[PDB]
Design a protein around this nucleic acid. Structure first.
Lengths: 141, 137, 127, 53, 75, 191
RNA sequence: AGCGUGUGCCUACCCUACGCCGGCAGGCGCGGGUAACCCGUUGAACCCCAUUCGUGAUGGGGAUCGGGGAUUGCAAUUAUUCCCCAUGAACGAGGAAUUCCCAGUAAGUGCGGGUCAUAAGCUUGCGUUGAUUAAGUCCCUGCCCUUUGUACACACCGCCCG
């Protein structure tokens, strides 16, 4: 495995947990309260979820040259039920993603990229690749 | 596993116990779903279960948070009554007390004789809507 | 409206703030609190311009005897926001054809003049 | 001089017309042409808008 | 009709019913457990994941949407 | 895959349309085994061509019905794949054989047409073509499964299996079987 | 993913990536772009999926109303609109009737353009996912083909008896 080698769900699942063990990520004190998207029906069932998003994003950046919060809000953004009106896109929160981006920096997984947008760092690139291997290794099944 | 309660009361409403807590709570006037969901998360409960389950302990703990939400990392924007006016509150009205304040507010602008008030009094509409074709039955 | 009890006795606090306190600031410090729509209107209104009106209010507040109501002050500014400076006055509030006359109680605060002069007429189905 | 005589004209239907005919209704504002539809129908050949499908 | 009311917490005796029955059925999903007992559906679920323990029941597909379980692994 | 072209994982070979005449608008694969009940499929242009279409897919298509469900083939393919698995657990066999059987058993042999008849319009017993027999059967079973599934906890894959199995050996438990017998009974009178 | 779109404009003004603050709504600082250069490998949405729910108008549904946050505008009160909470309706499949339709077609599903300061439940295309079903005929309906009848010819929605 390149991270590209591992399936997205298991990769994210494994990394997100690894982050949880590490114990040092950092977390707008909120996270108990927050929905994550105006579109959103209820907050996240796994109140633990902050880690999962972080993993998801780290993987998301590693794939691509550089990304920023607006893109993430939309990615997270689902369809919002206008009620009487037909449903439409609504890019998902900007505080969570930003905080995610800021926090990741602390670990050095990602760093400000040139010309705007955060890019993965070689430190992160190394870190993701390492867990990617661990996941591949676990088993067949 | 275990059993008990079916049928528990919190502050002046009867709450079906069979039901899931978050949903179970939402009988209480002023506890909508986004509410009750966040209250419970604050109140430390295994989210995974039925209102009929849980302890007398956890219950007071839900109520205590429910009527002092601000004091528990619940933001004001999550709240029913921001900006009171009469006291410049923030607040989150609950239970029998929502019907109450609803009455107050309607009275207020009926005293003052404002057109909205008048509308409520005749039992028409107060947002800008056309009244020619609908709300007829 | 000056002394122990005399007149006073209707109270009303606006936003935790008291009418004693209300009646003493600047409209500045009032809109600061909470109201948000009314405050933006006055800021943007601004430059502001119901100037003469506000002087017409104080004027007739003066000439009014010493006990009661008095004469009133007319206007077409439906979009005006009631602020403590106004309270106790009497406003002729136009609706299209009529000027409805309304004393502004302290409760109204933050509301728009238009909300107290109904334009339309209830209506009719049977009759 | 007559300070009296105008209220905002910056925006809305009232801020524009037909360069051809004054009409403030059914106005083609795309590509900066600013012709009312009725006129645009009559002038679309001289402007260079031709029927193909 | 069809009004369904469900026992939403374990009653001992209903715990016994579960392990001493379900080996009977060839097909078991949420619905089976619900109809044949009077299980919540929510507490059906938890009984399925538990049953798959080291199984009374055996997985043949738990498509997100659906578990589909068979009888235990007998003769 | 290279040895024999099985189904999701099921063999086409050795399934025999146990019913002369029907033979052949039920399309298994007198060579045509594929992999998935989904295809670009252009059946519509010609009147016949539909027969070419694999019966499995034909069944899957009928599955995605009701305005909301239109165009959800992925959903149907998913349901079909599950149903075959449930059917297999229930009787071994080839569930595809089970499917074929239900189809063979359900097509109304005889039917009725609303012949003008003067007044008190009577109905004329007529025999029914094999294309119709196939077309009608697949409806019946799908409408059967869909109708059952709707207010019950049970899933379409399951209800489909139940409709398919009961029909494969005509249990008459099935909605479809009862419907077919009703249509046929009507055909016989009238005459 | 695709049709399309933009400022430097007949007279006031653009599309906006990216940092920060805010739960949101949004606020704020930048910097490019007369564009096949930039917004935008339009990283859309259905969908697919690992969970929860469990057949309860319930978590289906989002009406109505209350309070509150913000955006457009000089001015929004008769809600322009948006959000946040709360209040959480009818509706559990639709009689008489009746529209439209043959292959990327019906249907689901998002997007962009027009309106536009602000405002989409609209219209007007576009791609995406994509069937069932006649494969014909003149029965009903509508219109034109002969032959034929007609006291009709403002033409059957026409011209008749006490």
């Amino acid at each position: 495995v390149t991270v590209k080698d591992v399936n997205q769900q298991e990769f994210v699942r494994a990394l997100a947990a690894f982050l949880k063990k590490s114990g040092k990520l950092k977390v707008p004190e909120w996270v108990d309260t927050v929905k994550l998207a105006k579109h959103k029906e209820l907050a996240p069932y796994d109140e633990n979820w902050f880690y999962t998003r972080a993993a998801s994003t780290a993987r998301h950046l590693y794939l691509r040259g550089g990304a920023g919060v607006g893109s993430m809000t939309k990615i997270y953004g689902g369809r919002q039920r206008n009620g009487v009106m037909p449903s439409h896109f609504s890019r998902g929160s900007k505080s969570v993603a930003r905080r995610v981006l800021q926090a990741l920096e602390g670990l050095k997984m990602v760093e400000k990229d040139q010309d705007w947008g955060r890019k993965l760092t070689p430190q992160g690139q190394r870190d993701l690749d390492r867990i990617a291997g661990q996941v591949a290794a676990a088993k067949k099944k | 596993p275990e059993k008990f309660q079916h049928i528990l009361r919190v502050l002046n409403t009867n709450i079906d116990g069979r039901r899931k807590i978050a949903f179970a709570i939402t009988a209480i006037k002023g506890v909508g779903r986004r509410y009750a969901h966040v209250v419970l998360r604050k109140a430390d409960i295994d989210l995974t279960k039925r209102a009929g389950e849980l302890t007398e302990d956890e219950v007071e703990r839900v109520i205590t948070i429910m009527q002092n939400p601000r004091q528990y990392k619940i933001p004001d924007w999550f709240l029913n009554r921001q900006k009171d006016v009469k006291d410049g509150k923030y607040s989150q009205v609950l239970a029998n007390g929502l019907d109450n304040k609803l009455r107050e507010d309607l009275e207020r602008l009926k005293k003052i004789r404002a057109h909205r008030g008048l509308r409520h009094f005749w039992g028409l509409r107060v947002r800008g809507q056309h009244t020619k074709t609908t709300g007829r039955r | 409206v000056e002394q122990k009890k005399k007149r006073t006795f209707r109270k009303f606090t606006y936003r935790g703030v008291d009418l004693d306190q209300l009646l003493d600031m600047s409209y500045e410090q009032l809109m600061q609190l909470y109201s948000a729509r009314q405050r933006r209107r006055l800021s943007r209104g601004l430059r502001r311009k119901q100037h003469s009106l506000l002087k017409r209010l104080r004027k007739a507040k003066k000439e009014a005897p010493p006990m009661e109501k008095p004469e009133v002050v007319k206007t077409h500014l439906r979009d005006m926001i009631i602020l403590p400076e106004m309270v106790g006055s009497m406003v002729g509030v136009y609706n299209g054809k009529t000027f409805n006359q309304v004393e502004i109680k302290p409760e109204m605060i933050g509301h728009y003049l238009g909300e107290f002069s109904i334009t339309y007429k209830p209506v009719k189905h049977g009759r | 001089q007559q300070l009296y005589w105008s209220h905002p004209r910056k925006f809305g239907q009232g801020s524009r017309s037909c360069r051809v005919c004054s009409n403030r209704h059914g106005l083609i504002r795309k590509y900066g042409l600013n012709m009312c539809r009725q006129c645009f129908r009559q002038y679309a050949k001289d402007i260079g808008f031709i029927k193909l499908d | 009709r069809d009004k369904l009311n469900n026992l939403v917490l374990f009653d001992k005796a209903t715990y016994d019913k579960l392990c001493k029955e379900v080996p009977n059925y060839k097909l078991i999903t949420p619905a089976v457990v619900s109809e044949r007992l009077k299980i919540r559906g929510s507490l059906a679920r938890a009984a399925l994941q538990e049953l798959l323990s080291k199984g009374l029941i055996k997985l043949v597909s738990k498509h997100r949407a659906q578990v589909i379980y068979t009888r235990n692994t007998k003769g | 895959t290279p040895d024999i072209k099985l189904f999701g994982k099921w063999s086409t070979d050795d399934v025999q349309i146990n019913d002369i005449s029907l033979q052949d608008y039920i399309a298994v694969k007198e060579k045509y085994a594929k992999y998935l009940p989904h295809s670009a499929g252009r059946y519509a242009a010609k009147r016949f061509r539909k027969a070419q279409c694999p019966i499995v897919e034909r069944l899957t298509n009928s599955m995605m019905m009701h305005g909301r469900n239109n165009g959800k083939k992925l959903m149907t393919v998913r349901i079909v794949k599950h149903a075959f698995e449930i059917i297999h657990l229930l009787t071994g066999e080839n569930p595809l054989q089970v499917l074929v059987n239900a189809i063979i058993n359900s097509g109304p042999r005889e039917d009725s047409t609303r012949i003008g008849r003067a007044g008190t319009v009577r109905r004329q017993a007529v025999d029914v073509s094999p294309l119709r027999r196939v077309n009608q059967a697949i409806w019946l079973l799908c409408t059967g499964a869909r109708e059952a599934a709707f207010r019950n906890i049970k899933t379409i894959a399951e209800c489909l299996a139940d409709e398919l199995i009961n029909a494969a050996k005509g249990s008459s438990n099935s909605y479809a079987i009862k419907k077919k017998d009703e249509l046929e009974r009507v055909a016989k009178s009238n005459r």
